[PDB]
Structure 1
């Protein structure tokens, strides 16, 4: 099912095995480094990311000490970090907008798992330049980069907010509206695993 889909839930407790395999996973975790709902480092280590892919890529936003922690989780989950995207934050004039240096950028680790095949490696470059939207928002160019890399494939975002829903993407987050699912096999395995629409233990 090509158009957006999402699942309001707690990503800690949802049974992601019902969702199937994805060519791309993306995650903007709420690392404990609290203004929103944070997750401890063991909770992050424990997320069942390994079930979501057999071959493909993981995009993992990091800041501060998660830069090292996210490298850990990425290896723990079975990936090799093969690239790193930085987003240079500008204004509308395209000038540039951590107690030692002011931070003009945000980092996104790129991990590979297995032997992904038929992707378009090399189409983009590891630098995004784009204006800041709201606080805490990734730039939208990341989805265009990801689509050029793996066109038409199943992609899943972890810890999205409603502004993150995207065609070809399934967005999981705890501030989304309900459960909107259109992929048949997913609607199936969801009804089988949750015959009553509550995600609990």
Structure 2
């Protein structure tokens, strides 16, 4: 079922096996980077322990990284069974097209690209590894990435981990703990969910 679906929950404790396989996985995790914290983080082991590998047999993973997560995300990427084959960077601009850790000011954000298995029938090569786009709101990922993903693998099932309510998108299932309840439509998913959560509570 093409339209937005989502599941409010803790991705740590949700049984992602019910959701089936996905041509594309995206995650922008709350890594435990250099202290701070305007939101609750996951520790390294909980990220290593996430159950990404059940989610795909053949396809791609898009993994947002910052700070030390540039090295840690490469680990999770490899442990989860992926190989990093690309790396998109987003150049942050203003509404007039100019540019806006300790030693250097960050003008960009990184998103590792990982492959698993043997994806076939994908339009590899259509976009380039560079996104230029205005920062619409703090800590938000740019909508252009969904365009790039759709062009890459049109029509396919996709899942987002640690999405927020604005991340809901056709062909996508968004997981996030600040989402509005549980909105599901694809029957097989609705089936394995009722069979796994009869009284509906993770």
TM-score class, shorter-chain normalisation, is over 0.9
| Residue of structure 2 aligned with 1:108, choices 75, 95, 111 | 111
Deviation >2 Å, runs of 4+ = none
| Matching residue of 1:44 | 47
| Matching residue of 1:25 | 25
Specify the SS of the correspondent of 1:152: coil
CA separation in 1, counterparts of 2:178 and 2:186?
21
CA separation in 1, counterparts of 2:164 and 2:83?
27
CA separation in 1, counterparts of 2:65 and 2:138?
15
CA separation in 1, counterparts of 2:16 and 2:102?
38
The structural deviation recorded for 1:26 is 0.1
CA separation in 2, counterparts of 1:183 and 1:136?
30
What are structure 2's unaligned runs of at least 5 residues? Answer: none
Output one character per residue of 1:45-68: Cα deviation in whole Å (capped at 9) or x when no partner.
000000000000000000000000
The structural deviation recorded for 1:108 is 0.2
| Residue of structure 2 aligned with 1:84, choices 79, 83, 87 | 87
What are structure 1's unaligned runs of at least 5 residues? Answer: none
Two-structure CA RMSD over aligned residues (Å):
0.3
Which TM-score applies when normalising by structure 2? 0.98
Specify the SS of the correspondent of 1:86: strand
The structural deviation recorded for 1:37 is 1.5
Specify the SS of the correspondent of 2:125: coil
Output one character per residue of 1:110-157: Cα deviation in whole Å (capped at 9) or x when no partner.
000000000000000000000001110000000000000000000000
| Matching residue of 1:188 | 191
Residue-pair matches, total: 199
Output one character per residue of 1:71-114: Cα deviation in whole Å (capped at 9) or x when no partner.
00000000000000000000011000011000000000000000
CA separation in 2, counterparts of 1:18 and 1:37?
26
CA separation in 2, counterparts of 1:71 and 1:136?
21
The structural deviation recorded for 1:168 is 0.1
Map 1:1-201 → 2, pairs under 5 A: 1-33=1-33, 34-199=37-202
CA separation in 1, counterparts of 2:88 and 2:15?
29
CA separation in 2, counterparts of 1:195 and 1:166?
27
The structural deviation recorded for 1:44 is 0.3
